[PDB]
Design a protein around this ligand. Structure first.
Ligand SMILES: Nc1ncnc2c1ncn2[C@@H]1O[C@H](COP(=O)(O)OP(=O)(O)O)[C@@H](O)[C@H]1O
Ligand SMILES: Nc1ncnc2c1ncn2[C@@H]1O[C@H](COP(=O)(O)OP(=O)(O)O)[C@@H](O)[C@H]1O
Ligand SMILES: Nc1ncnc2c1ncn2[C@@H]1O[C@H](COP(=O)(O)OP(=O)(O)O)[C@@H](O)[C@H]1O
Ligand SMILES: [Mg+2]
Ligand SMILES: [Mg+2]
Ligand SMILES: [Mg+2]
Lengths: 520, 40, 548, 546
């Protein structure tokens, strides 16, 4: 009434998208399938890799489903569900992140023709939630207690689809002794830490019983310190050795010139007092987080005592576990029994970078590897393979289980599910049989990267489950299909358990959402 | 497209994608340009 | 003739001001504006309800079917819609239950009011029709109540309360989600039966920790609080048992500093030589009295200096960082400790008891385990929630809070007062108000009879979201209520309700076997807020907006 | 999809060239984008759609023939279904909705077949071998037009075409009008072969009353206005002579490009008087012949109007050329372009005049039309539609036009098949056992072809807001048991389809739903050629305009 315009009130602020109609939930399916299109060729040891360059011009080459989704910034609400299941699978088990996204996207693709029909949204989720319940119990039948036979086989299969997999005759030997240094109930993720050195060849890497860190700073009295110790004593200290104000405040009031000379001499004596207490204990190596000036470094040079500083907090945490020492935040409490040691100490230069080598300790929980490679991504991909391979043998120590891989898992689980759909329902049988065919995308796509015919393989898989039982799977070398138990290819059950639960939860989340609202 | 903007990743039109034989040919010719410089 | 007078004397107000009145169909447009966001919450109603995705301006995505949570991130324009938005938020705060009912019921009262206004009913007579019908509605709810919770804690009885509430929010598996919430409730209850003490409960006691990875079946209940923390000096499994003595300090551990111009004063070199060793003896003397009391763990509320952390590692005392306030406040309720600011020796009566403190890898990071045991029971237990996606972890946290809020409804009133579920509560009120509309002479019976028609949305929504025809299923349900009551007592026909999928044709027999019920305390405020929400919209004859 | 490919690396093209699976993915999206329209318009439960020209005018069109014609699609593969919907009108005239949905589904399910690495030639052969057995199976399951004693066919033939249209509820009334209209306009050629000249029935647009009160005109109705108002509005009596002339009755210039040069001024007037006198010489022969109605293709000058009023003759001007040809055969008149014969003399013969019972001009809602009824030589028919507005009659005009083409196929070929998803569901069970015999890589191609035909019966239940599974699952129960029904009628199990109103499975013969057999043969062959051409495109090259 205040104007002739009389505008029409809009319920939502301008810029809000629309929804409902027909195809809104279909838009979320095509978004996940398109993301799946990139991760399908990366499946299998013969698979390829994806080159991704971000807005910062940072080159990264990854076939991992978790790393690929971290590089790209996904603004699509439903497509971000594949990112969560990729990071959740990589956090616990570390392997199968590519298979989870491929499986989760296939469950949405098989549910696409069901949404176009009169099938309700909740009726589709009833099929996936019921089939995953019988699928987890089927994995327990696939697994074996394997208390007999006492890391070697599972570490070789984890390196597949990724670099150095052909070098598994070498790097796998270091992955076995890496986690064995970690005692049960601890299994520290930092102590397996690996440093990357640009340059060199990856075949020149070697195993070290302890942590190796970068100096990052050049000391004027560094060369005067011996680089070869026959029986070194490592002393971890949080003290800051140099000439500086002591605690949090600096002020000096001196009335007389005679007392002014004693103030300077007192500062030198207090700094040297902390230096004498270190020499009286016979500590050959001193590590500190806080900076250390050239005054304390030169004092340790005449005594043939090694000095170091600037070391990160994560590296010195590995020192205490390597030599079995302790952290002393003051120099007055240093006692002989708190100092660690090792067999020998030698400083070797690797790729124009000198490191401190800790090795030869009787009991050491620290494992640090030095990797080499031509490209900056080569040294990144190797540790990326080693970090994922250690988590496989890490979970094997808690529970020892073997499940046949190479598509053998999805074919045996889908067999018992087709029988369940035959006995009951017939309303749900269309959904259950679709779930059995949705599990077949993993063995089908994995055989497409090798150039083999998918029709000939899949037709020979279904009819062969009589005499093949649970261990019947695909063989790459002979191009034929044969028992994987004789092929020695092994894999823990924790990979397939979390893969079926993450793919079902991610699929049922989007199928239960028919509307997506984006403000602004 | 169905009539609504489809964007999976930020900076859609900015980033490009190479695949197939054309992706392999561009990588070999990129090394041939560097080789012929070093071979001299 | 070429240009209009363009509303002369419109310069009395700014050009951004607009006037909208009940005349010229704007009251109809306001009701039509409700239906835009009403259908959004209709598909989210019930156990088969569909969750919705809402992206805010910052990029955060919250996937939930709760009407109170969805309307928070949405930007509302129409003024009368904010009346409906703020009405659903009050229901979530007060009772923590029945949020989707207030959104749907208040929206249907305006839909049936469109026919009432078209017939010529004034806004005054329409308000009086809903107020007189609501007073009769609240009186019939107390007459139709069946059963009671009786004892506070039971293993079976908690499955008839929390389970039907969490069935609508992330349905999934039934017994898996019900056992996790029902376990944490039994720990925070003081019990102490036959003592005659006044029961007490806290809705913020139970905390849900979101941890990505794993599966829902791997979740468990922890009697203690779980934080993501890295111990400074060392990690200790504390296998030496005999429990522990723990102390909590809300103040940081460090030399007391003067609040004004803290400065080191050294007159001569004699005072400088003893200044370095002087500060070392201060922390040593203060931390020695704590170690002599047998305190193996110290909870700090701020940053602790390195000089203080040195002597704590000498006696093997753990160090915990508790930032802000509320995180540290709930720690003392677990062990039963009283914080004190000073760094001196704590009082032995104020020391807590925690048997084990463990650090293990759950979601890839080190978490500290405060879990308690059978004896020396603790309060404010936490529930570890494992999931593949973080979006599911957010609504399940609110789904557990809905079950925790249902426990609060067992304290203030005399009992639980279970009502028939599956929509049987709103359906029985239809036949009772219909008889009430005839008993009232005059023109006010038009708004009373249509007030019961608005209750038909509950059976129609549950039937539509279940994939069933509302034309076949709904009239078949009235056949049980059309036979009224026989010549004999003990009539079980009040348990008939709406079924999801399955064999349809009504079904689920009597809901007494299904064990799904509703809370009476929730339905009391759900009808009152929804009625006042629609009454406020109908009581406004003219709406004025600014700037747009 | 995903990120755009690089532009001509080492290829040196001025346009855009994309290769790989991105072409076949965009080709499916081209057919899926145009299908979602045609999908919801299929079946009696389908709903009309409104197209807007942005100029203020709207167009309500149910079938996908005009929808795809109006909607501009610049995608190269998207124009195939646009031309396919325009094609289906040419051969059969009906089925534009089913041919687009089937052809879009054949490509949709084939998108997963190429991911198997199966070559399209194996996919194409699998669809063609299954089609050769499908056409033969349709000829085995057809039913004769005999049925019971009475016809009981042509009435039910029109009711199937009236479905999906707003007049579908009135189909019982319009069933007798379409049958009686086509039987009147039938002709004979090829020494005994009966032909059906579709579009010969005039469709008139009138306002008022209702569609149920539309009267079938026993004869031809010409749409035009009376020349002069002084002419008699109604002509009665038997044997009404009608003259159809294609010659201009207006005064025209002498020859074309010549020039008239006059020397003696006394002849200036006499030469000009002859130019106006020659025109009236042809009118004098018409008046003496007794022609009551004079039909002229072009206009009529005022010189010829005064002679028609005095002689009580009805003149008509601005007649369509195609309209007068149907009047000549119906009334028996011979079309006269000019007055002449083999001899040098010029005269008019009475044999060129037609005969009918009555000629009357009716005026309803600003629409003036001359009703010609009771043609002795050859009967005719006309339908006057009544509706809300002109655009409401635009859909009713095309609704009756599709019904004339369906009845034509049943009279020429008496073989009909039941509707409601009977043919699409019966071909599935027949091709399931046939694919197992061939095997190899063609077993999956035939299996997907039988499942692609399921989109037609499933679309019926989706647009009806009912449960599709219970209707399709019970549908297969009769067809799967029909192949195994085995000889001995007691067979049954066949000719069953979905009833969308009652939600039950009943016999389509008793329900009155039948469809021509030739409509299934031409639809499956035309829908396949659209899918074959798309599956064979590896690379799309788009050259920018200069
Ligand atoms: N040597 C092998 N022989 C057969 N199958 C293998 C072999 N190595 C890996 N696979 C299969 O490849 C699949 C993917 O393995 P991997 O690359 O470790 O996970 P992702 O593809 O998620 O990175 C596994 O499911 C496994 O069955
Ligand atoms: N399995 C079931 N069968 C029948 N009815 C159910 C079922 N689960 C829930 N309901 C009913 O659906 C209603 C949903 O309530 P809702 O509005 O979601 O409460 P809130 O908003 O507090 O979550 C409940 O009142 C309950 O009676
Ligand atoms: N009364 C009916 N009952 C069931 N199905 C029908 C009925 N009428 C038509 N149909 C089905 O609808 C489909 C489309 O029919 P129609 O509308 O005549 O063609 P179009 O959709 O191409 O215009 C046909 O295949 C037929 O099987
Ligand atoms: Mg892997
Ligand atoms: Mg609830
Ligand atoms: Mg038709």
């Amino acid at each position: 009434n205040f104007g002739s315009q009389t505008p029409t009130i809009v319920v939502l602020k301008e810029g809000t998208d629309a929804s409902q109609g027909k195809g809104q939930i279909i838009s979320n399916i095509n978004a996940c399938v398109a993301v799946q299109e990139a991760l399908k060729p990366t499946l299998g040891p013969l698979g390829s890799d994806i080159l991704i360059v971000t807005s910062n011009q940072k080159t990264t080459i990854s076939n991992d489903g978790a790393t690929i989704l971290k590089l790209l910034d996904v603004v699509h609400p439903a497509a971000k569900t594949l990112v969560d299941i990729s990071r959740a699978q990589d956090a616990e088990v570390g392997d199968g992140t590519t298979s989870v996204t491929i499986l989760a996207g296939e469950l949405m693709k098989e549910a696409k023709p069901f949404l176009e029909e009169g099938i309700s949204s909740h009726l589709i989720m009833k099929g996936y939630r019921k089939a995953v319940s019988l699928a987890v119990e089927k994995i327990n039948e696939l697994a074996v207690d394997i208390t007999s036979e006492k890391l070697e086989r599972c570490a070789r299969t984890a390196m597949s689809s990724k670099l150095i997999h052909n070098n598994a005759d070498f790097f796998v030997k270091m992955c076995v002794d890496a986690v064995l240094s970690l005692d049960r109930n601890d299994l520290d993720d930092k102590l397996i830490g690996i440093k990357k050195i640009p340059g060199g060849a990856m075949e020149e890497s070697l195993f070290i019983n302890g942590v190796a860190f970068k100096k990052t700073f050049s000391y004027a009295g560094f060369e005067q310190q011996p680089k070869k110790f026959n029986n070194p004593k490592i002393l971890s200290l949080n003290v800051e050795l140099e000439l500086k104000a002591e605690k949090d405040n600096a002020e000096v009031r001196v009335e007389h010139v005679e007392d002014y000379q004693a103030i300077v001499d007192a500062e030198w004596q207090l700094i040297f007092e902390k230096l004498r207490q270190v020499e009286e204990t016979g500590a050959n190596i001193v590590l500190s987080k806080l900076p250390i000036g050239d005054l304390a470094t030169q004092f340790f040079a005449d005594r043939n005592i090694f000095c170091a500083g600037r070391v990160s907090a994560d590296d010195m945490n590995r020192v205490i576990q390597a030599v079995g020492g302790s952290i002393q935040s003051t120099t007055s409490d240093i006692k002989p029994e708190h100092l660690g040691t090792c067999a020998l100490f030698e400083e070797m230069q690797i790729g124009s970078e000198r490191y401190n080598l800790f090795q030869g300790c009787p009991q050491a929980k620290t494992c640090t590897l030095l990797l080499r490679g031509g490209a900056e991504q080569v040294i990144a991909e190797v540790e990326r393979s080693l970090h994922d391979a250690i988590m496989i043998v890490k979970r094997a120590l808690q529970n020892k289980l073997i499940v046949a891989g190479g598509g053998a898992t999805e074919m045996e689980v889908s067999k018992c599910l087709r029988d369940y759909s035959k006995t009951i329902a017939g309303k749900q049988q269309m959904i259950i049989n679709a779930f059995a065919k949705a599990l077949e995308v993993i063995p089908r796509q994995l055989c497409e990267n090798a150039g083999f015919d998918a029709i000939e393989i899949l037709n020979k898989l279904r009819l062969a489950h009589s005499k093949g039982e649970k261990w019947y799977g695909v063989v790459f070398e002979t191009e034929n299909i044969g028992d994987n138990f004789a092929k020695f290819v092994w894999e823990p059950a924790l990979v397939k358990i979390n893969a079926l639960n993450s793919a079902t939860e991610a699929t049922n989340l989007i199928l239960s959402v028919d509307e997506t609202i984006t403000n602004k | 497209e169905m009539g609504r903007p489809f964007i999976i990743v930020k900076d859609q039109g900015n980033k490009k994608r190479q695949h197939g034989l054309e992706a392999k040919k561009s990588h070999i010719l990129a090394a041939r340009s560097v080789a012929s410089i070093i071979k001299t | 003739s070429l240009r209009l007078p363009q509303n002369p004397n419109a310069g009395l107000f700014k050009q951004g001001y607009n006037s909208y009145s009940n005349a010229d169909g704007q009251i109809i447009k306001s009701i039509a504006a409700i239906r835009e966001l009403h259908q959004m919450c209709l598909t989210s109603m019930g156990p088969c309800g569909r969750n919705k995705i809402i992206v805010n301006h910052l990029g955060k995505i919250i996937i939930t079917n709760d009407a109170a949570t969805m309307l928070r991130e949405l930007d509302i324009v129409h003024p009368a819609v904010k009346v409906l938005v703020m009405a659903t938020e009050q229901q979530k705060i007060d009772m923590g239950d029945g949020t989707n009912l207030v959104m749907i019921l208040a929206g249907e009262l305006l839909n049936v009011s469109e026919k009432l206004i078209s017939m010529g009913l004034s806004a005054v007579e329409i308000i009086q029709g809903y107020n007189m019908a609501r007073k009769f509605t609240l009186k019939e709810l107390d007459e139709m109540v069946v059963g009671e919770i009786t004892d506070k804690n039971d293993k079976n009885e908690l499955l008839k309360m929390i389970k039907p509430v969490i069935s609508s929010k992330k349905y999934g598996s039934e017994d898996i989600l019900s056992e996790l919430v029902s376990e944490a409730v039994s720990h925070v209850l003081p019990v102490a039966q036959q003592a005659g003490e006044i029961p007490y409960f806290n809705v913020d006691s139970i905390r849900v920790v979101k941890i990505m990875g794993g599966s829902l079946s791997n979740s468990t209940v922890i009697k203690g609080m779980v934080f993501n923390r890295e111990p400074e000096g060392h990690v200790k499994s504390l296998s030496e048992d005999k429990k522990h003595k723990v102390a909590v300090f809300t103040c940081p551990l460090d030399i007391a500093n003067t609040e004004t111009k803290g400065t080191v004063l050294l007159h001569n070199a004699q005072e400088m030589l003893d200044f370095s060793k002087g500060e070392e003896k201060q922390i040593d003397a203060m931390m020695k009295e704590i170690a002599d009391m047998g305190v193996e763990c110290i909870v700090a509320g701020a940053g602790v200096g390195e000089l203080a952390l040195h002597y704590l590692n000498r006696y093997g005392i753990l160090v915990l960082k508790v930032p802000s306030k509320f995180e540290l406040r709930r720690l003392c309720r677990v062990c039963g400790a009283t914080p004190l600011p000073r760094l001196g020796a704590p009082t032995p009566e104020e020391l807590g008891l925690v048997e084990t403190v463990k650090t293990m890898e759950i979601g890839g990071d080190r978490v500290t385990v405060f879990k308690q045991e059978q004896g020396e029971i603790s309060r404010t237990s936490t529930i570890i929630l494992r999931g593949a996606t973080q979006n599911n972890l957010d609504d399940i946290e609110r789904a557990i809070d809905d079950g925790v809020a249902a426990v609060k409804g067992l304290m203030k009133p005399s009992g639980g007062k279970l009502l028939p579920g599956a929509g049987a509560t709103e359906i029985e009120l239809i036949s009772r108000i219909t008889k009430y509309g005839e008993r009232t002479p005059g023109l006010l019976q038009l708004a009373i009879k249509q007030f019961a028609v608005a209750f038909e949305v509950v059976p129609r929504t549950l039937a539509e979201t279940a994939g069933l025809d509302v034309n076949e299923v709904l009239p078949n349900l009235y056949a049980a209520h059309n036979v009224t009551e026989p010549g004999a007592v003990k009539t079980d026909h009040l348990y008939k309700g709406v079924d999801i999928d399955g064999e349809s044709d009504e079904g689920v027999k009597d809901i007494r076997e299904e064990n799904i019920y509703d809370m009476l305390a929730t339905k009391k405020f759900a009808i009152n807020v929804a009625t006042e929400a629609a009454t406020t919209v109908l009581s406004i004859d003219q709406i004025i907006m600014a700037k747009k | 999809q995903l990120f755009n490919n690089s532009r001509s690396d080492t290829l040196f093209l001025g346009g855009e060239k994309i290769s790989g699976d991105d072409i076949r993915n965009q080709n499916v999206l081209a057919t899926m984008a145009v299908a979602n329209v045609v999908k919801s318009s299929l079946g009696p439960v389908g709903l009309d759609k409104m197209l807007v020209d942005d100029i203020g005018d709207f167009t309500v069109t149910n079938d996908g023939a005009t929808i795809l014609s109006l909607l501009d699609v610049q995608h190269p593969a998207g124009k195939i279904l646009v031309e396919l919907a325009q094609q289906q009108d040419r051969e059969i005239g009906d089925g534009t909705t089913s041919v687009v949905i089937i052809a879009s589904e054949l490509l949709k399910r084939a998108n997963e077949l190429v991911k198997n690495k199966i070559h399209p030639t194996t996919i194409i052969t699998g669809f063609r071998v299954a089609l050769r057995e499908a056409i033969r199976f349709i000829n085995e399951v057809l039913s004769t037009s005999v049925d019971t004693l009475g016809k009981e066919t042509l009435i039910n033939i029109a009711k199937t075409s009236m479905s999906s249209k707003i007049i579908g509820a009135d189909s019982d009334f319009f069933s007798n009008m379409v049958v009686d209209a086509l039987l009147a306009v039938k002709t004979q050629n090829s020494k005994g072969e009966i032909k059906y000249p579709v579009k010969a029935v005039n469709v008139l647009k009138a306002h008022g009353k209702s569609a149920t009160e539309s009267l079938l005109v026993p004869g031809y109705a010409l749409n035009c206005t009376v020349a002069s108002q002084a002419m008699p509005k109604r002509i009665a009596g038997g044997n009404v002579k009608i003259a159809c002339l294609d010659l201009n009755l207006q005064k025209a210039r002498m020859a074309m490009g010549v020039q008239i040069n006059i020397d003696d001024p006394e002849q200036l007037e006499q030469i000009r008087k002859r130019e106006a006198g020659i025109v009236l010489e042809r009118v004098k022969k018409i008046i003496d012949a007794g022609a009551q109605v004079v039909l002229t293709t072009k206009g009529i000058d005022d010189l010829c109007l005064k002679e028609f009023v005095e002689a009580k003759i009805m003149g008509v001007r601005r007649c369509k050329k195609e309209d007068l040809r149907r009047i000549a055969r119906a009334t028996g008149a011979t079309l006269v372009s000019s007055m002449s014969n083999l001899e040098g003399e010029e005269t008019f013969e009475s044999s060129y005049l037609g005969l009918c019972d009555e000629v009357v001009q009716a005026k309803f809602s600003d629409d003036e039309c001359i009703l010609i009824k009771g043609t002795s030589k050859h009967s005719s028919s006309s339908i006057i539609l009544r509706g809300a507005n002109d655009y409401s009659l635009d859909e009713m005009e095309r609704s009756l036009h599709d019904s004339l083409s369906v009845v034509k196929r049943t009279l020429e070929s008496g073989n009909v098949v039941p509707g409601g998803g009977c043919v699409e569901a019966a071909l599935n069970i027949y091709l399931d056992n046939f694919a197992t015999t061939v095997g190899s890589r063609e077993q999956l191609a035939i299996a997907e072809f039988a499942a692609a035909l399921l989109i037609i019966p499933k679309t019926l239940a989706v647009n009806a807001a009912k449960d599709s599974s219970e209707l399709v699952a019970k549908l297969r129960s009769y067809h799967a048991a029909s192949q195994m029904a085995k000889p001995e009628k007691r067979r049954s199990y066949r000719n069953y389809g979905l009833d969308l109103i009652r939600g039950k499975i009943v016999d389509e013969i008793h329900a009155g739903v039948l469809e021509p057999t030739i409509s299934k043969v031409k639809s499956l062959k035309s829908a396949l050629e659209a899918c074959v051409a798309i599956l064979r495109i590896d690379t799309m090259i788009t050259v920018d305009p200069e």
